[PDB]
Structure formats: structure tokens, C-alpha cells
Design a protein around this ligand. Sequence first.
Ligand SMILES: Nc1ncnc2c1ncn2[C@@H]1O[C@H](COP(=O)(O)OP(=O)(O)OP(=O)(O)O)[C@@H](O)[C@H]1O
Ligand SMILES: Nc1ncnc2c1ncn2[C@@H]1O[C@H](COP(=O)(O)OP(=O)(O)OP(=O)(O)O)[C@@H](O)[C@H]1O
Ligand SMILES: Nc1ncnc2c1ncn2[C@@H]1O[C@H](COP(=O)(O)OP(=O)(O)OP(=O)(O)O)[C@@H](O)[C@H]1O
Ligand SMILES: Nc1ncnc2c1ncn2[C@@H]1O[C@H](COP(=O)(O)OP(=O)(O)OP(=O)(O)O)[C@@H](O)[C@H]1O
Ligand SMILES: [Mg+2]
Ligand SMILES: [Mg+2]
Ligand SMILES: [Mg+2]
Ligand SMILES: [Mg+2]
Lengths: 387, 388, 399, 399
Amino acid sequence: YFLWPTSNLQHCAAEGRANYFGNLQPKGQQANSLLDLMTIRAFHSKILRRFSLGTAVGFRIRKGDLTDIPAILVFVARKVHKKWLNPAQCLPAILEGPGGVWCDVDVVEFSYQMFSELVDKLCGSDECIGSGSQVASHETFGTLGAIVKRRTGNKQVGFLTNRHVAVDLDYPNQKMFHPLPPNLGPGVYLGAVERATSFITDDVWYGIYAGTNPETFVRADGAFIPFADDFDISTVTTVVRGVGDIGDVKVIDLQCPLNSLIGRQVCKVGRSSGHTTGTVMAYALEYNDEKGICFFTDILVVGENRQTFDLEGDSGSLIILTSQDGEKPRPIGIIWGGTANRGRLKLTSDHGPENWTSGVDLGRLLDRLELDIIITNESLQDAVQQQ
Amino acid sequence: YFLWPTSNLQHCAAEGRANYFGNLQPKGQQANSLLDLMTIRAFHSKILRRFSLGTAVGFRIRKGDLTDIPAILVFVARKVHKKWLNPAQCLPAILEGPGGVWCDVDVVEFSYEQMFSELVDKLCGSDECIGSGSQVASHETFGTLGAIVKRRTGNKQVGFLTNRHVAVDLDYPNQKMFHPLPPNLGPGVYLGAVERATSFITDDVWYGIYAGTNPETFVRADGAFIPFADDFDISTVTTVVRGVGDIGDVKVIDLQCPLNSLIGRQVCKVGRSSGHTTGTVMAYALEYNDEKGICFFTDILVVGENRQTFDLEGDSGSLIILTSQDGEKPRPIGIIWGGTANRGRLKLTSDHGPENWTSGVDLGRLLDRLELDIIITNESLQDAVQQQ
Amino acid sequence: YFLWPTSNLQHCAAEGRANYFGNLQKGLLPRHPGRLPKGQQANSLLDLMTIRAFHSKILRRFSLGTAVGFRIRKGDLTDIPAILVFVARKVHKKWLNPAQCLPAILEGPGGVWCDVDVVEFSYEQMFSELVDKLCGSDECIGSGSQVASHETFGTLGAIVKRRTGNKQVGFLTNRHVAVDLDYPNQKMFHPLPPNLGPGVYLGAVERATSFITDDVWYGIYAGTNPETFVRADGAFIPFADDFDISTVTTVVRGVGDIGDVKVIDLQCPLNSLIGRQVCKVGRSSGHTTGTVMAYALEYNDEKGICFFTDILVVGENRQTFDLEGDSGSLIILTSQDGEKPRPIGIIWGGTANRGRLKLTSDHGPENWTSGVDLGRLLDRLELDIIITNESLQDAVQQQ
Amino acid sequence: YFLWPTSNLQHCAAEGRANYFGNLQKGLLPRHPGRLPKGQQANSLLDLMTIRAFHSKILRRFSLGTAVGFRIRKGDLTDIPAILVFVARKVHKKWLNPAQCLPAILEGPGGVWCDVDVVEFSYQMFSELVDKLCGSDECIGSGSQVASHETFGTLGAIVKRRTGNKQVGFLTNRHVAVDLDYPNQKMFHPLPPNLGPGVYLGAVERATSFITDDVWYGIYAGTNPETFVRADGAFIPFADDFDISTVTTVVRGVGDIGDVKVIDLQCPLNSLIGRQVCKVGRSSGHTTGTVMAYALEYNDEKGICFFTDILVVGENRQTFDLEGDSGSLIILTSQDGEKPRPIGIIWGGTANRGRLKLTSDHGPENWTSGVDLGRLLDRLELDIIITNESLQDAVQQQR
Ligand SMILES: Nc1ncnc2c1ncn2[C@@H]1O[C@H](COP(=O)(O)OP(=O)(O)OP(=O)(O)O)[C@@H](O)[C@H]1O
Ligand SMILES: Nc1ncnc2c1ncn2[C@@H]1O[C@H](COP(=O)(O)OP(=O)(O)OP(=O)(O)O)[C@@H](O)[C@H]1O
Ligand SMILES: Nc1ncnc2c1ncn2[C@@H]1O[C@H](COP(=O)(O)OP(=O)(O)OP(=O)(O)O)[C@@H](O)[C@H]1O
Ligand SMILES: Nc1ncnc2c1ncn2[C@@H]1O[C@H](COP(=O)(O)OP(=O)(O)OP(=O)(O)O)[C@@H](O)[C@H]1O
Ligand SMILES: [Mg+2]
Ligand SMILES: [Mg+2]
Ligand SMILES: [Mg+2]
Ligand SMILES: [Mg+2]
């Protein structure tokens, strides 16, 4: 018994969005934050969607390296010289949005098992369940992202993993086991999915009109599972194995400087690939997936030293910023997985394309789900008694 | 976001079910209604699912014909003579449930592309009006418009009712419906989007009783409601079920009313794929034998008459209608359930082969969990058109 | 622990065959004339085999196989002794180079002759009261009842009894129903094995035969190839010690009480087997009727081995005679003069089992069915067929 | 004519097997739950098998099979007698309900006890030697490729028959030298005539598929009344016209080998378990490995229980065999100063080649199954020939 919106997604906010764009229509103070870059792309969403496989915001990638030039990333199937494009297809080097603020436009060529002691510990060989532990429904396997606790209601303690790992269609309930479901091997029952989110409109997720398409949604796939009534929550640790103690979530501020997210180093620990490291390359990837529907996904990561950042089954690991000042590493997202048709991007000519990985903004996901992540075992036992 | 139960399905309502069976634990007062048959089957559900392909309630089937004997139907893969069964596998002819009430138990052999007529063409866009039986398509699947309904609570907008997995996908953030074809495949008018749908409902809120001892028991209630779009001409919507005529209001399936008013009755439906077909109710409350650790129920079981299959793929959403036996308006009692994959039959006589049976959803109960009231006349339609 | 022959299938007895044919055509010559007199005509199956065997090199030269019987002309079986030669696609004489066309007459050893005609040749369920009764809905087991191993379904041929040893009573079905290779035991159930449904345990396969050389089966050298075998697949299962034999009947439902086996004599006149009407009752297609069309069907494969099959049946009134799963049914001669119907074979099941052949041009291709000589199989397995319920209890006791 | 038992594998020896378990009541009064005398620790494979057999009821409880040998701890073989229990995925004790956790010690009848270990379990090469083994060499020996008209394999050893004519031949496992469509099984090196050049080696005179546990080991190795040993092996005598002078007994890449080392169930454990073995095969050349277990148990899909004798894993992370090595002679490395002796032949194939997890720093590793040569040579009545001179003696002693 679900409910979509009744008539408020057609000609009350469909022309209300066209009003924000219907109204507002050279050395000038170039864009400083993601908030500026997103608006520039949104205004030009017609000529940018005209020939592209998708767009994103970040820094311009020049001769294989990330620059310090704020730019809108435009993805194409095959990058060719300017000599093989009819004039309708070539893109300008610079765009101007509302209010004179500007940015660059560069082209990026784009397309849509490990064995270690740590991988075994995450797959049931350890004596504790935490971030990185394998979590499985009756069909698919995944990764437990983070220990969270509910804000309203019972204030029940549970964990957070992304959608399509913990939810299937034919089954009427979604039970989760570690490390295997009973129909496949041994495992302990963790609980069931109480509430999860699939799609959120851009204005409620980002706060702005990230596009002119009246049907624009955000791939915010994330699920919350409260620990079962008869489950021993004392076997849960908050130590991110292989990383250590982590801090609280740093929200992705659209107004802070660009290079505080773009280019920063991130790492994760996953069920399938252990501890891998990567670099954030873009933000707010736009659909260019023709159905008339516009989809967004927040984080885009690429692995370091040409090694892939994730594998199939890592869906649900915690995307964690590596410590730059000896502080506690703080998470900003959780790795999203799907659909498994995997996709590459081309950086250099002496090497082939490299696998990129998408993620969901943790700061925004924890808010629309009303959850607070637990960072130490002492603060955990507090929420255990609040139940 | 969604909202599933927090701790209310494990050892709060699991002991309320375990109590109903913990507490309870011939010669005249035989079962009279579906409620009696369901309780007897539920109490003996442990020793019944032990060797069976499924169970259902209804009348005993002897030599291919429905008798007047209330009985619990037990489905097997292949029926053999009593001489080849060890006594642990043979089933008793009579069961006695709680309170001395009893009933019979008989065995039924059981197992789990388009017609061409002027009526089928009218349903696929050749007519000048959209109604029950008209083809409704998303960008992926085809279906059948079941009935014109209107929402009771909230606003009062008029729309139509079709079953789920025609109107719902997982990837889309909205599900648009078109007649007779989606824009990406041919011509068509926009009908609207799916406002709400239900997939599974627990037995205790659906029937009102504990139909089984399995703590995880659900009802395959796949059905969706679509409000007509702002730019759609609601004047092209008719309430006449083509091939049947003007229909009455929903006949609710009362578990307490006498058996022979539903079991055995003659039924018909009009669908996108097979037009106007006739059939017979054979059982009720068919349970799962589907090995997911889950116990699934389906309310109506229909078999086509004169050896011809009752439905085909694409009929999903058709209105199951009781034929008029006294002269009143024919009344709907169910809507055809989807799936139609895995193609499963039942064997009635030995001189003829198996026949295809069709699943349905109880219309009277589904219209309440979706908060809808069916409209049967054009004047009653124009009322809801202005009541918006 | 299986056992093949010792060295006796290479040289010695192998050349023993070569000699029997090396004797002839060192010592056998027609005179001049090719207007051969009609007293030397082939009269029996044995005569036709000797002509075919001697001429096997030119017969398997361009052919899909050969067989002996009556000439088939314009869709009707005649009473003319002939060697049937099978081809892939039959064409007019004008499109054949002289090396491929076949002579109308062959002259075998001793002047004996016969005709040669050409036939173009190639290699889902019923619903009736009888088929259900045969598949476990009846209260008695007999001929035609469904018998199943853990993989495949079949048909019980006949109630038989062993000659030597304990003399235990059992039933007869063909090998490809009752034998698989992964399993170390062969359990048989009616109508279904426990891993598929309900059923009663009938017993296990005690003893079966797969291939027999032509000289041990027929008694003659039916071909010049030293590696020549007969597809004699048949298996014997004794009823279990704890089985209730009181539910076993010998009445072939739809046929009645049958007589004793009529052995196929290679020397008797042709028309006592060729052309005779036969019928069977099977698990998969019930009671169908057909007609014997040939005998000793020969087929050489791309490995150098020569295979034989005894009976060739085609269904009557263009209805197919059998379906897949009918493997093991009893081929019974219909009673012509009020006498007891007698069985002559059992339906064989395999890869070269259900091919098609074209008889008339106004009708499509028709399915032929293979069989094994019942009289000869009962000797290789040392079994005697039981025909009445009283004759059963007599044999039930002597274990 | 095929044969199987009549009433002796059904309640003759099924109560005889149930008897063994029932002169084993053990008192209905238990041991003391503290210490145990170390004179009762398992010393031989025979002791380990009986302990495993008695507890077979609780061992099938959430496990896919068992075997006997030494405990494998943190990736290394110890010398501690233990019963290996195979699981689908090994997990911590914290995720097991008490019905699934396994005891560290088991005590059998008569006080004998042992450890219980857990193992995670699941069910070509180009070199100068491999070319010589595949027809580029001028001599036939152990390791040379042997092929039927369908499949390729590896010649195990030059053997001679014990009874009868006493004919010289070679030994390979059954699924390499035996097919079921063919009525004969011809062997060629290196290719059959339908695929390439090759010389005719001979035909299969005898083969074995399954042997009951009581006749194979000498004891009742399990509680299941239907228990068999996968003893697939076939014997081919050299053809009548074949040149046996090109046959050598020198195992190329190993050297001259000694006589067969019989697997004594009563001798000390560590003389088989843990010993180093090597083989030369058609598909993977000369590889070396380590014996890891014995008497591998498996129940599938009916009441029927299958056993396999030898379990080997390759050394230094290299796989021990590949497909096509089926039939190679597995030889333990040199008896300390003497000549290496063979103990088995690689079975190879359908389900008998799976993986097992040893360390977390490495992925899974391929294990290879084998059958006891000492026991296989007895059911087939064959004697292994070890030198070229001893071969020429029996060649003319043939009858
Ligand atoms: N629609 C298009 N489809 C394909 N290729 C295009 C399209 N528009 C532009 N290009 C190509 O992309 C080039 C622009 O590359 P870009 O802006 O990324 O350069 P850069 O960042 O300075 O350096 P580099 O490409 O070495 O990283 C154009 O010169 C042209 O060849
Ligand atoms: N578990 C079972 N599996 C298969 N067949 C069974 C099983 N239990 C009983 N039977 C068969 O079902 C028969 C009884 O069938 P049933 O109860 O349907 O009889 P009925 O309704 O009086 O008549 P009819 O056969 O016409 O339906 C038994 O005689 C037995 O042969
Ligand atoms: N090698 C061959 N391949 C194909 N067709 C052949 C071959 N040899 C002969 N034929 C054809 O077969 C014909 C002989 O047919 P056959 O002996 O069956 O005649 P029939 O019995 O008198 O009549 P009918 O053709 O009506 O049965 C030849 O006329 C020729 O067309
Ligand atoms: N049924 C079972 N399925 C899966 N795992 C099991 C089962 N029973 C026990 N285990 C696991 O197997 C472990 C025993 O491991 P094992 O006997 O191999 O120990 P070890 O040899 O001392 O050390 P190591 O595990 O490093 O080889 C138990 O601690 C438990 O985690
Ligand atoms: Mg660039
Ligand atoms: Mg009945
Ligand atoms: Mg002819
Ligand atoms: Mg260990």
C-alpha cells in the first residue's frame, strides 16, 4: 500500500519549475562552489543534453590530469577531433549562466574476486559484525554500510545499506542475514528492512532546480534495518576494520570551496574487494538516459594506480575520506551499485578505460531517513538502552 | 520512503498467531461456510502440507463434477490408486476441526497467443470508448482495464483499476499508462499515472482469521489504481462491460454465507487477450506450496468451461463477473491476478486432458484496502466527474 | 566387472566369417544368362539374408541401410520377396549416374534370387481411460503399466520367470528404460520413483543384454563386416521378495489373454511374419495397431560397426504406432482365426529407434518403430512368458 | 549377459551390516566428560574409518561429506589423526546454532577417539615432455595419450592378466576407455582414425564401475546399506597384431618404478597421509603433490552413498591435474633410497575434481581424486610389470 503524488507533479510544480527558468532569461568572478556549477549546467540543460551521454560538475581534466579549473564535465561515447564533427555537435569551451558567473566545458570519453585475510573476516571469518561485513537477502549479497540509530519512534538501533541489496520484489518481507541466508549456508538473522528510499525529487534532495526537466529524481537508494528483537547487539563494532576509528558525517556543502570535495582522496572497505583507495572526480551526474525521466547520482569515484575502486558485491560500503591532518576519517557517502552493466571512463591514451563507481550523499541520505551514525562503541551502548 | 512493521511481525503478532493455534489444541454438524473450511484446514495445515502440492477450500470433486459436499481440496502432482501408497501418504476422507465441525477431503491432480474477433479488436483501440476490457499499456507491459472506480478518502478523483506488475516497475519513478499503445511503440492517448498499489497483505487483515500456522503468511493482492490524467477526456469512458452489458455493484465474498452461493457459480470475464470467456469457480483460498519459507494465498480459482482455457497472458486485470442466474445485473466478485508465468493445470477427467486454471483477487476486499468504489453507470460516473 | 570376448573377435572366428564367404565366389559363378529361372526364388527370410549378406559391399555402397521382406510398390505391401534398400531421398532414374542405380534383381549363392526395391528413409501424449489405468490409476500391475527408473519412464513387457538358479518370477522391459550409467543400482517403481512422486517398489535389474553378434543371434553371417552386432537391448527385473505379487496380472488389457511366444523361424514362409498385423499396449500411447514391413534392418555407422534390428512396424491408418516412452511394450500378433494372440517382439528404444519413411505421395512421412525378437531374447535371458493368472501362482511358488 | 545380486544386497547383508552396528551397543552408560587415555587415540586409517562410520548420523547434519586423514590447521597439514568434515562455507563459531557447531573430539566404539577438522570444500600444458606423451615420442609407456573414438585419456601402467591366457595390456580408468553407444571399445595412440593418425592399441576386455564397501575395504565403512566405491577402471590387452616391442615401463620424467605399494588399513597413518606424490599425464605433464585425505564420503539424491579412496592436492600452489589426465599413474616420490612405487590411478572427471580453501592469502585450490591401485589390481586380477625385460617374458608366455 504505497503512495506516489496525486496531482502535484503536473502543472503546479511542472510550470512552477518552468517559472524559475522562464524568469531569468568575460573576466567575471569565476565559479567557486558546487552550487554555482550546478546552476550553470541547469540553465543550459537543453543544449547540453542535445548531444551528450551525461554531464557532471567538478574540475576540468586536461591531458589526463585533474586541473584546478572549475568546469562542467560533458560525457560522450567517442571523443574525436574537431575536424570530424558537424557544427551542431561541437561544444563551446566556456558557458555563462545566470548572473554572469561562468565555467569551463571539457569532454570526457565515457561509457556505462579478491582473497585476503580481511576479505575473509568480512565474510564470516571474524567474530564481530561491522562496516564491511557481508549482508545477504535470499537473492543477493551486499555490504553493511554503517551503524545508525532512529531519531523518531522507538529509537531502535540498526545499520544502513543501499537499496537493491536488501530488497527484492517477489518476496513480501526483506530479511537480512550475515554472512549467508539460511537457504544457502550458516548465518545469523540481523533483522528486516523497516523503511527505505528509492527516489527523491531534486528540490528536496539538493535544494535547487538542478535541471529544467519537470521529471527529475535522485538515485538515493538506501535502506535501514533495525536489529532484531532477539539479536545480540553486543557483537556489533563501530571500528571500520583496516581504517580505524572514524568521525561523524561531513555533509556535502554546495557552498564550500570546490577542491574540498573534488580531488579529495577516499577509501572504502568492502565485502568483495577489501580496502581500496580512489579519488572523487565529479558530482551530480545527470541522466542522459532517454525515458523522458532525469536521474541524478551524487558521487563519482575512480580508483588510484589504475586499480578498480570496487567490484560487484561492494554495493553498500562506506565511502570514507582519508585523514589529511591526522584527524579521524569522516564518511561522506555510501557506494551505490546498479545496474550491473558496468561502466568505464577514459583518462590516458597509454592505458585503457578505467572503472568509475557511483555513490550516494551520506549527509543527505541520513537526513531524509532521520538517522544518526554511531562512531564509537561507548556511544553505541547508549542507544541500546534507549530502545 | 516506505514503512514496514518495526517489531510487529516477530514475537508480538507471532505469539498472537501461536496462541490462536496453541489455544485450540462427523455425525451431523458439517461445515457450512468458507469460514468453517478455512479453520479446519488451518488447524490441520501441518499434517496437510506434509504431502501435498497445495490446498484450497470448496466442494468435493467426484468423477469430474462438483458435488454438494463441503470439502478441503488437496492438490497432488499425480493421483494414483490407494494400493500404491503407504499409510503415511494416504489422506483421510474426513477431517474434524475445532469445535466438532467436520468436512470431507478429496484429492485433485494439480500442477503449476491471442484470439481474433470483433470484440477483441474493439478492446485494442478499434472502439471509440475506453472501458472495462480495454487494453492498457505502460512502456513495458500490456494489461486490461478492470473497472472504473473512484477514491473515497482524500480527494474524489475518478480513475480505473488494474492489477499490479502491469502498472508497477522498480526502475521507473512514475508509471504512465496509455491506450492502446505506449508512445514508443505506436499511437495512443495518455491515461494517467499510478497513484497507489498493493502487493502483499497479511491473511489476518485480509480474511480476518489466521488461515495458516506459518508465521509468514501473505495474500497475493497485486492491484493498482490509476487516476485519469488532467488532459484526458473522461467523456470517452464507459461503464458498460462490453459483451456482458450493464453490471451491478461488487458482491462481497462473505466467509460466513452459505457455500453454494459462490462455489460452483458460473463466471465470465472480458479481457484484452481472450475476449469474453466463461468459467466456473472451483475453490477458494489456495495456499502456497511455493518453498520460499513464505506462505502465499490466492482467493479465487477459476477453470474455463467446455475444456477451453479461461485466460491467456495479457488478460491480467480483467473483471471476474458472476453470471446472472435470476435476471439481475451481473455482479463482479474478483479481478484476474497477474503472473501467468509457470503455466499450471488441473486434471479433472481421464478421457480428456488437463485444463488451465486461472487465479483471481477478491474484488470486495481489494476495493477497501485501496479505498475505491466501483462506478456502474454513466450517470453515476458524471457524479464523480463533478465531485472531483 | 564386465566381460567382452577373449581374442575371438579378431582373426580366427573373425576370418571364420571371411572363409564362409571366401568359400563362395571362389566356387560360385552364373552361367552366362541373366533371365534367371523361377524355381530358385527366395522363399524364406533366411534366403533373403544370404543374398543381402553376400552382396553387402555394393548394397552399403550408396545406401542408408538395408532390410529383407516384401517389395513395397506405390504404397502397398506386395507378396513379392525383395531386399529393401533405404536411401536418403528417392529420385527418378534419369538423375542417377550409372554407378548409383540399383539392379532390380540380385543373384545370391546357389542361383537363388530375389527382387530389390528402393524406399526413401530417415532416422506429445495421449489421454484415455486406459492410459491412466496404465500409469498407476489401476489396482493391478500388468503388461503396459508404467515402470520408471530414477531418470526415464518405460513399459512393462511381460511377466516372465527365470529358468536356472532360484527360478524367481519378474518382469521384462528393454535396457534403455531400466539402465543408467551413473547409478550403481537400478531401482524400478510404479508409476513414479520416490524422487518424482508416489510409487511401489518393484525390484532391481538383475540381468540384461545390450549387444549380440549376428551369428549367436540369428545363426548365420548376415554381413561381411567382422564387427557385426544386434541391438538386443532388454532387461529382466525379478519382483522383490517383499512385493505383493497378488496385484500382478498377465492379462494384456485391451488385447486379453495371450498365447505362448511364436518364435521367428528364418526358414518358414515369408508371409507368416511379413505383412502380418500386430498391436501393442503401451504406457505412453495405449493400444495401437500396425503392420510388419521388414526384418533384420541393417545400418552401418562411421566407425565401421554393423548394427541389426529385427522387427520393423508402421502404424495403421497413418496413425503413429508408438511414442517416446512406449519402449518395452509387447508386440502381439492379432488373432486371425479365433486362436490365442501370440507375442513376437518388444518395442526397442534408442537413437535409431523412431525414424520416418515415405510410403505414398498423397500422404506425409510415417513413423516406423523398432523391435527385438521376443523368442530369441527369452533364450539369451533364460525366461518363459506367463499367460494366465493360474499359470502365475504355479511359477510364484517354485522360488 | 549382465549380472547383479539377487537377494544378498537386500536383507541378507543389509541385516549383516545392521548387525555390525548392534554388536556395538556401547553400554547405554557414557564415558567421563573429562580426560581420555592417549593409548586410545587413532593410530591407523582403519581406526579412523570406524569412528567416522559410527557417528554418520550426526555427521550428515549440515555437512556435504567427510574424509579421514590429518588435521589441517591454518593452512598446513599436521600429523594429528582427525576426521575431515567438508562444509560449503566455513564461518566463525559465533554464527552457528548449537546443532551446527562440530565437536573438537569424537569418541567411537571401544574408547578409540580422534580430532574433527573443518575444510572449506566444493565439487592444457605445453612442454617438451607433453609433446612426447601425445605422439611425438617413439615409444609407448606410462603417460602416453590413449583415445577412443570419442574421448582422450592417459595410459596408467603396463599390466598383465593373472588368470586365463595371461595377456599383456595396459590399465586406464573406465570413463576414458568405455562408452555406451559403441558395442566395442577400441583404443588408439595418439588419435582415433576419425580424427588423425594413430596405431590401434586394442580393445577393453574387462572393466569395473562400482564396488561395495565390504568387498573393497574389508569392513562396513558406513551405516548406509547401499554404499559403493567409485572404482572406475578398465583393462585393455594389446591387439593381436600389435608390436609390443615399442612398449616401455620407464615412467618418463620419473624413471624406473618399483612394485605396487598396497594401502594397508592397519599400518601407521603417516606412511600414506601427507606423503609426497607425483605423476606424468597427457594433459599436464609431470606434476607433484601431497596426499591430503582418504575414504572420501558422499551421499547424493537417493539413499545411495559413494566413496573415493585417494584425495590429492598439488604442491607449491600448482594444480595437480587437468582434464585428460584421467588414468595417469600417481606415484609417491622415491622411497627413501629405493625406487618410487605407485599406489593409485587418477580417476578424473564429472564430479571428482573440485576445489578446497586452504589459506586466506590464496584463492581456492584444485584437488584430484584417485582410486587405490592395490585394490583395483585385485578386482581386475592384474599384475603390474616394472621392467622391459620382465615384460618380454610374459609376452610369449601369453596363451
Ligand atoms: N560533442 C562532442 N563529441 C565528441 N567529441 C567532442 C565533442 N565536443 C568536443 N569534442 C572534442 O573534445 C575536445 C575538447 O577536449 P577538452 O575540453 O577535454 O580538452 P582539455 O581538457 O584541454 O584536454 P584533454 O582532452 O587532453 O584532456 C575537442 O577538441 C573535440 O575534439
Ligand atoms: N497423496 C496422494 N497422492 C496421490 N493419490 C492419492 C493420495 N492420497 C490419496 N490418493 C488417491 O485418491 C483417491 C481418493 O480420491 P478422492 O478423495 O478425490 O475421491 P472422490 O472425490 O470420492 O472421487 P474421484 O476420484 O472421482 O475424485 C484414493 O483412493 C487414492 O487412490
Ligand atoms: N541409389 C539410389 N538413390 C536414389 N534413388 C534411387 C537409387 N537407385 C534407384 N533409385 C530410384 O528408385 C527407383 C526404384 O523404385 P522401386 O524399386 O521402389 O519401384 P517400385 O516398387 O516398382 O515402385 P514405387 O517407386 O512406386 O515404390 C528407381 O526407378 C530410381 O528412380
Ligand atoms: N557446520 C559448520 N559449518 C561451517 N563452519 C563450521 C561448522 N562447524 C564448525 N565450523 C567452524 O569451524 C571451526 C573449526 O575450525 P578447524 O577445526 O579447522 O580449526 P583449526 O584446524 O584449529 O584451525 P583453522 O580453522 O585455522 O584451520 C569452528 O571454530 C567454526 O568456526
Ligand atoms: Mg579535457
Ligand atoms: Mg475427488
Ligand atoms: Mg518399391
Ligand atoms: Mg583447521
